[PDB]
Amino acid sequence: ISMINIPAYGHVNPTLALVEKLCEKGHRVTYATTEEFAPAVQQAGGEALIYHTSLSILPQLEELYKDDQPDLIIYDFVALAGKLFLNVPVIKLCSSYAQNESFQLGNEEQLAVPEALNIVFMPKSFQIQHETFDDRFCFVGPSLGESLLIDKDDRPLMLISLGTAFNAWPEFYKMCIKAFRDSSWQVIMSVGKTIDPESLEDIPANFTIRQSVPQLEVLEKADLFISHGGMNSTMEAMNAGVPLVVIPQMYEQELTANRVDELGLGVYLPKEEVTVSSLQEAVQAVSSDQELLSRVKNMQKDVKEAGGAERAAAEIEAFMKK
């Protein structure tokens, strides 16, 4: 089994727990990625078939290593390179929303037809217009593995992380400090490289400011997560049953922000309305809403019942028949 995937963490990381499941089941998993994702793929048992790209291109690099022809193709829905290939059974991975004849991603050949098996890394309840998706799509939820020393107090814990979004918006992190400085919240805030924490004037006692944090592990203790609306961060929030305040930047993150809001799993706070006061208001409204939290608990149940990397690896196997 070879799986072709574009070089971006958001697409690679749900695949990692699945190559580990496939490897432990006695399969050969080759993985076309750059050197950037080579250590993570090989740490999960994959064979990193390195390739070069100018980070609608060409699959010549993958064609080169054609000598050891793979037995099954599994391409991320964006890496159309893998879809091109040799009468080999193929499987599509939907690291975002799945698309069919009734719903497509877009605001404005025939390679975007749904495969016989399409694996989507969200529960079906989260998919936009899920009523229109048939047996061709298998909604397995986030594909996570199976830690660190976070103890915390008996007061509510907040995670703040915008991920790769708003990399030139250091005022956001300053507004968060002013918003929750004197509150009963304990705040863990990941700033990436957007702002140097030591450059800050007075880091409050209830804040912990890092460049990066183990987001999965913080979420298991967190009571609220101010996020940017990436699919992975949103599904990790729901896997842990953590309500959301979503501040999106990109188009797909805006869809998810609206999706979170319409499912009653949190609030969508657009970037242009983000102030010290609206951050306080959003956190106060979400954290004090018990019916919202039970809906988040319901969605957490949907995430668990979705099957994860194990159900996806099993459906990949039962697919082998033609």
From Swiss-Prot:
Resulting phenotype, E236A: Strong decrease in activity for both pterostilbene glycosylation and UDP glycosylation
UniProtKB keywords: Glycosyltransferase, Transferase
GO terms of biological process kind: antibiotic biosynthetic process
Domain of life where this protein originates: Bacteria
Matching SUPFAM superfamilies: UDP-Glycosyltransferase/glycogen phosphorylase
Annotated effect of mutating Q253A: Leads to about 2-fold decrease in specific activities
Variant or mutagenesis effect after changing E252A: Almost abolishes the glycosyltransferase activity
InterPro entries, per database record: EryCIII-like_C, Glycosyltransferase_28, UDP_glucos_trans, UDPGT_MGT-like
Thermal dependence of function as given in the entry: Optimum temperature is 30-40 degrees Celsius.
pH-activity note: Optimum pH is approximately 8.0.
Effect of S96A: No change in activity. Dramatic reduction of the catalytic efficiency and glycosylation levels
Reported regulation of activity: Activity is improved in the presence of Mn(2+), Mg(2+) and Ca(2+), and inhibited by Ni(2+), Zn(2+) and Cu(2+).
Record field: catalytic activity: an NDP-glycose + an acceptor = a glycosylated acceptor + NDP
GO molecular function: hexosyltransferase activity; UDP-glycosyltransferase activity
Positions annotated to bind UDP: N13, T164, S190, V213, H228, N232, S233, T234, M235, E236
Family named by the database record: Belongs to the UDP-glycosyltransferase family.
Subunit structure: Monomer.
Domain notes: Adopts the classical GT-B fold containing the N-terminal and C-terminal domains that accommodate the sugar acceptor and UDP-glucose, respectively. The spacious sugar-acceptor binding pocket might be responsible for the broad substrate spectrum.
Protein name: NDP-glycosyltransferase YjiC
Organism: Bacillus subtilis (strain 168)
